[PDB]
Amino acid sequence: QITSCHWNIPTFEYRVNKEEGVYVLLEGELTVQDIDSTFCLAPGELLFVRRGSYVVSTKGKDSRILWIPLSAQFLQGFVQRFGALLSEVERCDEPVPGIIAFAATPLLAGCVKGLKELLVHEHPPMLACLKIEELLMLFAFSPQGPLLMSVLRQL
Amino acid sequence: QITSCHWNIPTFEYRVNKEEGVYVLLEGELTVQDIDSTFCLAPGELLFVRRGSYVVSTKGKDSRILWIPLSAQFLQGFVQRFGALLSEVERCDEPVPGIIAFAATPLLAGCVKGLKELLVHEHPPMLACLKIEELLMLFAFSPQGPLLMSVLRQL
């Protein structure tokens, strides 16, 4: 379900993500480009990406990255569980970018090191579901939360 | 709800916990004694304690510890959310100790550093609820999980 990704890409490739998701760069480099914009991120930064098509590249480096896909089912079972707190979030903007970048935060950093750790140590599967709810809940708490919220109504 | 605790106790005191809970020693020393047994724990070790009465001491040290109370309501709303996975856990033993100690594990360690971090950095309140579900889920996954499960039916 949630995948460590050893990628080497010197030029670029194309991705076509039928689901919303999260790209997080564990080791190496990773660029994500949509029609609008380009995002270059350090480890262990992440991006939230809408449904869509994307240009990805590693710059020919050896890169371990983490792809977390967010099913519609999960996203519902999430907003269901927490919809009351999420109604504290403001409404819109209405463009919603499609690639959403997040300011580096110690709590976000901790949530990332949680995912890393989950690859290396044996655990219950549901600990990952929880780690993602935590990440999502941090997004919704962020300044960029209303973006996510706007994406979250459409589906 | 969830409380940092600056305690200095040179001899001992008495606690009478109407709820199940978790004691985790952030800085200092902490002993927890029930009728059966005594537990001395390093930072950042923790204990799960049943409903009951306890002898606690700091050994006169300056001690920051964390008391996480687990309401019956929460414990239900927890077992509800995850009762299917918890039915993988074995049944009993039937004594259930009353103080449950857990082997030091990197994932448990990470869950503890998550709680620490939650004191210092601003966050949504529900991130703590999640951190506790994570800790609980690690207990149920542990060798000592059936103990917890046995406690969890009684209530």
Numbering used by the authors:
A (entry chain A), B (entry chain A): 11 to 165
Sentences from the study reporting this entry:
The operons encoding genes of structural components of the secretion machinery and associated virulence factors are all under the control of the AraC-type transcriptional activator protein, ExsA. ExsA belongs to a unique subfamily of AraC-proteins that is regulated through protein-protein contacts rather than small molecule ligands. The ExsA protein consists of a ~100 amino acid carboxy-terminal domain (ExsA-CTD) and a ~170 amino acid amino-terminal domain (ExsA-NTD). The ExsA-NTD mediates homo-dimerization but is also target for ExsD binding.
